[model samples]
Target: GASLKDFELSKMLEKVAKESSVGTPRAINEDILDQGYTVEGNQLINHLSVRASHAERMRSNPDSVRSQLGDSVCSNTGYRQLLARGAILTYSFTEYKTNQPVATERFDAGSCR
Candidate 1:
């Protein structure tokens, strides 16, 4: 059943969560900071802190951003492997200045072209 697979997926994510990279903050770009991630159910949610101006710009054209991210995730070997195993990947961004949510994009097995 889905529950059984979800449990296994959660366990797999737990192992990944223990990796040093999980809680480390990394600069993704001038406008975005990768603030690590957390796992819930079969979803791996990446926390991102974005410059307020950049977040506003992205909010105006969220579809394009999501599509671009989807393409990259589809091509990433690690993400692909997780997708193959029934995992969902989520990108959650918030404004670095205000700490308000900017945008969220979700990718699952069905996201691949």
Candidate 2:
């Protein structure tokens, strides 16, 4: 059910996020010390925010790149490159319907691709 186009788009997003100088991590770090978040606290916050930012970028992409890539890179090279270094990242709003977990998603390229 995972469409490659969505996956391809997520790869594009990571590139954008990292390359952009606007409203994301690069901007956050630009004034980190002046904000008074604290060196230690801000360091933690920086990584944490990047984590969320990446997921959001992907979450909204490929219509949410197979949350299992949400597991890791899909085993298929085409699939892996589709991620282009992007990751599945984390859990989400969609899972609220099944706390029990309906099925196991796999990254097995042999079957996944």
Candidate 3:
């Protein structure tokens, strides 16, 4: 089941990741958008609409898992700051239960700015 704990864990992961490393310099790389799935105790929380644009600088690349598609992804300034820093950003997400999907949203990208 997706809970606030799930969200917090995702947040911490992102914080560490956003400071992870630099990517292609002076170039906007291809956007890697995909749906991810996770299975747990009666929880088939899948992910979708995870997306980001290529960047034009050596960017602060965060983990795809934490950046978006996670349960209750960031909803503050972390993502905007990353964008301002020329980093590629995953800006959307969706949660699923069994065979049903939930509403998607452009929650903040990563908690780790």
Candidate 4:
């Protein structure tokens, strides 16, 4: 149920988290990435994705969730600026996206820059 909000969070942030609007120094931190989930009533579904490597087009050109949800959006809470997003947090890179189950064989490592 990760759908776009019916409002813009940036404008909302400009009204609420005024000072918090500033971005990360390096890029974005992991703590922000973890809380990147957006709220839909009570459901806090994960909505953001960070690129793990240069080859990942999804991670580049960070998009502000604030801009995505205008009017109805409350504010931008999570951050994903300088991190390797889109990568699975629940699994080790060596597992090669197999996730959960133990690695049955050797695999490549995540491409970190």
Judging by lDDT against the true structure, name the best candidate: 1
Query: What is the RMSD of candidate 4?
Result: 16.7
RMSD of each: 2.1, 15.1, 15.0, 16.7
Candidate 2 regions exceeding 4 Å error are 21-113
Q: Give the TM-score of candidate 3.
A: 0.21
Q: In model 3, what are the clashing residue pairs, if there are any?
A: 15-112
lDDT of 1 by residue, 20-100 (tens): 256469899999998887888898888889998899899999999999999898999988988888889888999999889
The top-ranked prediction according to TM-score is 1
lDDT of 4 by residue, 1-113 (tens): 32244233323323323343234222334322321322223122332223344213222332322223221122222322211222111211111132222211111113221
lDDT of each candidate versus the true structure: 0.86, 0.33, 0.35, 0.25
- Tens digit of per-residue lDDT, candidate 3, span 60-108: 3334434453343334355445334333334323222232222322332
Ranking by TM-score: 1, 3, 2, 4
TM-score of 4: 0.17
Arrange candidates by lDDT, highest first: which order?
A: 1, 3, 2, 4
What is candidate 1's TM-score against the reference?
A: 0.89
Per-candidate TM-scores read 0.89, 0.21, 0.21, 0.17
Candidate 1 ranges with C-alpha deviation above 4 Å: 20-23
* Model 2: per-residue Cα lDDT over 17-77, one tens digit each: 3443244323334212111111111011112122333434544564345554434544545
Given candidate 1, what's the lDDT at residue 61? Answer: 99
Worst 10 residues of 1 by lDDT: 14-23
